A paper describes a structure:
BCR–[name] is a constitutively activated form of the nonreceptor tyrosine kinase c-[name]. The improper activation of the [name] results in chronic myeloid leukemia (CML). The recognition of an inactive conformation of [name], in which a catalytically important Asp-Phe-Gly (DFG) motif is flipped by approximately 180° with respect to the active conformation, underlies the specificity of the cancer drug imatinib, which is used to treat CML.
The other structures include active and various inactive conformations that suggest how the kinase domain might convert between the αC-Glu In and αC-Glu Out conformations. (C) Active [name] (molecule C, structure 2). (D) In cells the active conformation of [name] undergoes rapid autophosphorylation that is expected to trap the protein in the active conformation (indicated as C*).
Author numbering:
A (entry chain C): 104 to 111
B (entry chain A): 229 to 250, 254 to 502
The structure:
Amino acid sequence: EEIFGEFE
Amino acid sequence: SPNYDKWEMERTDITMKHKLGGGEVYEGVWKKYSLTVAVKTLKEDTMEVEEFLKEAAVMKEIKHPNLVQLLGVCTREPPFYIITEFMTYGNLLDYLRECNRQEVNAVVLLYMATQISSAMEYLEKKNFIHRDLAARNCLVGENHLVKVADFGLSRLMTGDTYTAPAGAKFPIKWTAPESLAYNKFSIKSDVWAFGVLLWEIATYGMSPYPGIDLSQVYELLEKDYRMERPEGCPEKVYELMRACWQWNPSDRPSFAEIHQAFETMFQESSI
Ligand SMILES: Nc1ncnc2c1ncn2[C@@H]1O[C@H](COP(=O)(O)OP(=O)(O)O)[C@@H](O)[C@H]1O
């Protein structure tokens, strides 16, 4: 899956 | 203890052997000692010379038996290298997945946690934060030796709270609430992560909050949701994960108390 990402 | 200078390595003392990672990391052989070393390389054209080099500087400062050792750097001409000790078995996450669950008993596991908890107590005292603690950044050696590595986001630190440059993207499931929301990292961020890194290890390499999406993690931590006790995981060690996952960073144990919990086979204070 995808690890990194930004929060909102 | 390098060649012709304190940390300066002539591009000549190293004999590159072959790619290992994607910004490129090779395996090489450092002549003066015929030691096999790992060599991290910089993408020849990206305003990193400053940034990239900061990593090799955080390292010159620390020296612990469970923290991957810096052995030298190449700066005077490109490409820019950073040389460190080699760790034959690679990252812990991978190792755990592939490994044989017989040779890796629940004690070898405990052994790994203790090794890491130890590198953190040390880092805690030197007052350093490892802004990206997780299995994929731990390396392995002979007989299950584990070493923490990947000090890219690593910061020394004056005050007790670092504000990550705004507009960033970080590993959600390993990042703590006060960081996911206010881009503020602390030695308590690591404690939160460490709590995940124990879940990783206990589940022999699974992906955190399994089946749950990245967007749903935070709002779920707010409603007080936490992962459940991994199978075969001693209630004593789970109990310690929860400690690390306290909403208020102030209620989280310290690495010093954490290491004590392990090193003592459990005969010390997080309750
Ligand atoms: N000191 C080391 N010894 C052995 N392998 C290393 C060492 N340092 C880094 N590596 C390897 O370099 C690879 C680099 O991966 P990378 O491209 O930087 O992103 P990622 O770790 O997410 O795959 C890692 O898979 C790791 O196994």
